[PDB]
Ligand binder design. Structure first.
Ligand SMILES: [Mg+2]
Ligand SMILES: [Mg+2]
Ligand SMILES: [Mg+2]
Ligand SMILES: [Mg+2]
Ligand SMILES: [Mg+2]
Ligand SMILES: [Mg+2]
Ligand SMILES: [Mg+2]
Ligand SMILES: [Mg+2]
Ligand SMILES: [Mg+2]
Ligand SMILES: [Mg+2]
Ligand SMILES: [Mg+2]
Ligand SMILES: [Mg+2]
Ligand SMILES: [Mg+2]
Ligand SMILES: [Mg+2]
Ligand SMILES: [Mg+2]
Ligand SMILES: [Mg+2]
Ligand SMILES: [Mg+2]
Ligand SMILES: [Mg+2]
Ligand SMILES: [Mg+2]
Ligand SMILES: [Mg+2]
Ligand SMILES: [Mg+2]
Ligand SMILES: [Mg+2]
Ligand SMILES: [Mg+2]
Ligand SMILES: [Mg+2]
Ligand SMILES: [Mg+2]
Ligand SMILES: [Mg+2]
Ligand SMILES: [Mg+2]
Ligand SMILES: [Mg+2]
Ligand SMILES: [Mg+2]
Ligand SMILES: [Mg+2]
Ligand SMILES: [Mg+2]
Ligand SMILES: [Mg+2]
Ligand SMILES: [Mg+2]
Ligand SMILES: [Mg+2]
Ligand SMILES: [Mg+2]
Lengths: 48, 109, 48, 122
RNA sequence: GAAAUUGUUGAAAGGGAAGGGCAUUUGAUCAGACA
RNA sequence: GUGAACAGCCUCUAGUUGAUAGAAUAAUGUAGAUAAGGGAAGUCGGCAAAAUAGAUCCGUAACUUCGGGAUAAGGAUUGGC
RNA sequence: UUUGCUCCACACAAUAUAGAUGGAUACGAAUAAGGCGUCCUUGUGGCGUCGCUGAACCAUAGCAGGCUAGCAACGGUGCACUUGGCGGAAAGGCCUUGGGUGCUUGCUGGCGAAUUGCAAUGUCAUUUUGCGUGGGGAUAAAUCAUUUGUAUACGACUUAGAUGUACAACGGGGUAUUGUAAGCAGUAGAGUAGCCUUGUUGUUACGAUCUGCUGAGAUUAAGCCUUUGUUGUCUGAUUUGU
């Protein structure tokens, strides 16, 4: 907890997220959900 | 105790070899195996069959394969009593592809 | 745990990005409920 | 003989940062212990009681030998050899007491307080 | 078989050098002297 | 063999596999390298480095002791089948 | 690792000591103002008193203080105990109850003391440690080695390891990186050959490249994520006490 109360306007701004990156950070990720992935590329040589 | 066992393992060399300087890789490869053998059998004493050596130096120094299928036979030592009563003996095992084979235990004779 | 990215609108009444989307980086700390197991009382002493 | 040497954890056993593993010493010293264990079995000493009582080592006459340094100059390049010597002994216990008896010497005003401490008290 | 210098053992001291002078406590050690 | 070639690079014959080792991979180095946007602003000074490069074809200035300058410059093309 | 440890008790033995020798005797605040007693209307109050040094106060007599009797008091005080209470600034000390007990020089007696020879500190404090005893009380860890990588030149740091949401070795699935494996087939292919039964796709093949099975194949923690599968390991070394 902070050691003074800030009237910073820049603080007190009541922010509200719109979107949160879920795409893998082990590369140049494109797809957030495996949903999104399977929905875009189609089906593969394993799979159904 | 002892136990007298033989099994057939694969080993990832590629992980244990990643980064290693070239002129040293295949030698590090040899050694890394010896290491691999005491991890499993418990034995300081570890011997490599000359074929397993070729099997290693198949592709020049820098060119070790990523995976190797091995036969680690643990046996009892003989003569002039070395420190430990046992030793290992690695042999290469003729597989088409070392991919995806997991560790089997060999029943002998 | 690491960081990721976020998109949110902005509320800086004045800035060229007022009521606009911006993308900000955010870390994320893993924070599973701590558990209370002891208590300590301290005292003022002319030494500290 | 330690300055500018490695540091290892294996030295906490003796309270010391700098510590080594000098093989070719070990092998020469333990090859001389081994020689006293011989002489002790041969003397009939109890091989369990044995403890090393004295093990000094000093310098043996050097060895010359040269080395070739820049601009056509010679430098010594010497072996540093050693005399070792050890002595083992049967450990043993106790020592009893036995010594003097202290020749007590006190003035006449000093035997007085004494022989009155008995007349007066316990 | 000296010294420089080194190993072991015995004693002693050591808060950014060590050694020295006058004096005395302490420990160790020693002469002389009584009759 | 590639190629203009006794070049470089790879191989046959023959000859070696000799040059203390082992484990790590901090700073600082030596030697090998890449780096966005800018492009000598760096520095005594482009020092260093980089750019160019073979061959075929097109094209080629001042000046000249008419022998040159000159691969001047500037350009295109280049595998495989 | 030969019965080791700790607190309470005594016993011997050491070793020390910046320096015992009746008592470190508790408001606070003011200083061109206060202490104390006392009265009252409880105030910046009335009245009185003191200072001018602690040269005070308390204690102090008894073989370095022995052994004894008694009276008067009903007090003091030393000790072990018990009751209730207070104290965190470093509290580790203060106070209070109740029995028991020693002493009392409050006062009056009986006895002792030499010969330490005319002084020789004439030895009475408290320090730390060690060795056995027996009266309670207690039955751990740390380090090396191995291991992780949130750390690292070496030491150091941060993890893990006695049977389980254990750990490692493979295998599986995710996540990535590349850009379509090998094989086989085709009426794809500039085209070239060879045997005729010289073609109403004539046939056997061959031909850089192309297409299909194929976003396939390969690689993926060595400092990625995960795991009901598979297999293996789970007590070596040394050190420490008030
Ligand atoms: Mg990433
Ligand atoms: Mg295996
Ligand atoms: Mg690397
Ligand atoms: Mg130094
Ligand atoms: Mg150095
Ligand atoms: Mg060093
Ligand atoms: Mg030299
Ligand atoms: Mg010369
Ligand atoms: Mg007396
Ligand atoms: Mg001689
Ligand atoms: Mg000195
Ligand atoms: Mg002196
Ligand atoms: Mg050399
Ligand atoms: Mg290391
Ligand atoms: Mg300039
Ligand atoms: Mg240059
Ligand atoms: Mg370039
Ligand atoms: Mg050009
Ligand atoms: Mg062409
Ligand atoms: Mg014991
Ligand atoms: Mg008052
Ligand atoms: Mg009143
Ligand atoms: Mg009043
Ligand atoms: Mg007074
Ligand atoms: Mg009297
Ligand atoms: Mg008395
Ligand atoms: Mg008295
Ligand atoms: Mg006395
Ligand atoms: Mg257990
Ligand atoms: Mg294992
Ligand atoms: Mg494809
Ligand atoms: Mg293919
Ligand atoms: Mg097929
Ligand atoms: Mg690392
Ligand atoms: Mg499986």
């Amino acid at each position: 907890k902070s050691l003074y109360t800030n009237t910073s306007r820049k603080a007190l701004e009541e922010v509200s997220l719109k979107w949160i990156d879920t795409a893998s950070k082990f590369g140049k990720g494109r797809f957030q959900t495996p949903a999104e992935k399977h929905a875009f590329m189609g089906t593969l040589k394993k799979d159904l | 105790l002892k136990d007298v066992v033989t099994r057939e393992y694969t080993i990832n060399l590629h992980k244990r070899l990643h980064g290693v300087s070239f002129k040293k890789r295949a030698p590090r490869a040899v050694k890394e195996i010896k290491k691999f053998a005491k991890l499993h059998m418990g034995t300081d004493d570890v011997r490599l069959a000359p074929e397993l050596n070729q099997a290693i130096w198949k592709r020049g120094v820098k060119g070790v394969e990523y995976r190797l299928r091995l036969r680690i036979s643990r046996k009892r030592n003989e003569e002039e009593d070395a420190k430990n009563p046992l030793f290992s003996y690695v042999e290469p095992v003729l597989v088409a592809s070392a991919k995806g084979l997991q560790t089997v235990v060999v029943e002998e004779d | 745990a690491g960081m990721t990215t976020i998109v949110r609108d902005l509320d800086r009444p004045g800035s060229k990005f007022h009521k606009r989307e911006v993308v900000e980086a955010v870390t994320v700390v893993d924070t599973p409920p701590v558990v209370v197991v002891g208590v300590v009382g301290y005292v003022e002493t002319p030494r500290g | 003989f330690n300055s500018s040497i490695g540091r290892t954890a294996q030295g906490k056993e003796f309270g010391v940062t700098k510590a080594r593993w000098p093989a070719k010493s070990v092998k020469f010293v333990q090859g001389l212990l081994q020689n006293a264990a011989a002489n002790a079995e041969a003397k009939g000493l109890d091989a369990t009681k044995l403890y090393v009582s004295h093990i000094q080592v000093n310098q043996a006459p050097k060895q010359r030998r040269r080395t070739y340094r820049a601009h056509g100059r010679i430098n010594k390049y010497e072996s540093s050899p050693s005399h070792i010597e050890l002595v083992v002994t049967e450990k043993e216990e106790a020592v009893a007491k036995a010594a003097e008896k202290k020749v007590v010497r006190l003035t006449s005003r000093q035997r007085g307080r004494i022989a009155a401490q008995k007349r007066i008290a316990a």
